[PDB]
Design a protein around this ligand. Structure first.
Ligand SMILES: C[C@@H](Oc1ccc2[nH]nc(/C=C/c3cnn(CCO)c3)c2c1)c1c(Cl)cncc1Cl
Length: 269
């Protein structure tokens, strides 16, 4: 439709699609082989992920999709986020090219390598948490947010780099109380979800509030109850979870303070 952005346009001729990766609600994501995404070398053929409208399309699907593409242009590169590589708006159907995370999302990454009984050593788990904290701090600094913030929304590269998916200016067990009841989202509500994700990591991909149907959960939070410390999880990291789950948002740590705490934990080597 419109227009041509020379900072981002990529010719479809050097883009052969491949097997689907997953969906959706905004668009199908396929694996794809791209030729010459790094123009220092017109030969090196690296893989990417490509986002497209599925086809009984919209009228609320192309709208946010192009809105999604414009948002990623403005934030720019960061190591701990799914970066935008190029776009194809010149010959018909819209393609959005992004970095490929070979190992799927964080929750699948953890559960697939789970032990059978009583790889994912302690520093790797801290490494995952530190990286996601680094990504969320950057997003907040660009006055952008990510309300969802579950392990299923963090992708893992071939090199165990954590990259947050989705960017912009019913998953009820991850949501801070004010976003759950008052329906208001802040940077401090993001920190609540990070605590839940912290717990997702050190249970190696467990389900939050296990055995609890999602309803009465609000009463237990009102009663001051939080999830217990997972086994073999050190009390320092459970202390951070409890700080992320403090009822008052101003009593919660900011993403800066969570990066320093996790950094001090990684430095223990
Ligand atoms: C809907 C999908 O969006 C994206 C967006 C950018 C991406 N860059 N790279 C991948 C690789 C996906 C993959 C590679 N292996 N596997 C099997 C793993 O079980 C899945 C990928 C997926 C998604 C998925 Cl597929 C998963 N979680 C979150 C999201 Cl948003």
């Amino acid at each position: 439709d419109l227009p041509l952005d020379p900072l981002w346009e990529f010719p479809r001729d050097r883009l052969v699609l491949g097997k689907p990766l997953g969906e959706g609600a905004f668009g199908q994501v396929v694996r794809a082989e791209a030729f010459g995404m790094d123009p220092a070398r017109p030969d090196q053929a690296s893989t990417v992920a490509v986002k497209m409208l599925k086809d009984n399309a919209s009228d609320k699907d192309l709208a946010d999709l192009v809105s999604e593409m414009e948002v990623m242009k403005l934030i720019g590169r960061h190591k701990n986020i799914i970066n935008l590589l190029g776009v194809c708006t010149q010959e018909g159907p819209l393609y959005v090219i992004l970095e490929c995370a070979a190992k799927g999302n964080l929750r699948e990454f953890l559960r697939a390598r789970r032990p059978p009984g009583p790889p994912l050593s302690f520093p790797v788990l801290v490494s995952c948490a530190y990286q996601v904290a680094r990504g969320m701090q950057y997003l907040e600094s660009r006055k952008c947010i990510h309300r969802d913030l579950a392990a299923r929304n963090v992708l893992v590269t071939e090199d165990n780099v954590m990259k947050i998916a989705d960017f912009g200016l019913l998953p009820v067990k991850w949501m801070a109380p004010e976003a759950l009841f008052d329906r208001v989202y802040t940077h401090q509500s993001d920190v609540w979800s990070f605590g839940i994700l912290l717990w997702e990591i050190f249970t190696l991909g467990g389900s939050p509030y296990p055995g609890i149907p999602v309803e009465e959960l609000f009463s237990l939070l009102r009663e001051g109850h939080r999830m217990d410390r997972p086994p073999h999880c050190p009390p320092e990291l459970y202390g951070l979870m409890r700080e992320c789950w403090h009822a008052a948002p101003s009593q919660r740590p900011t993403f800066k303070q969570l990066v320093e705490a996790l950094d001090k934990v990684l430095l223990a080597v």
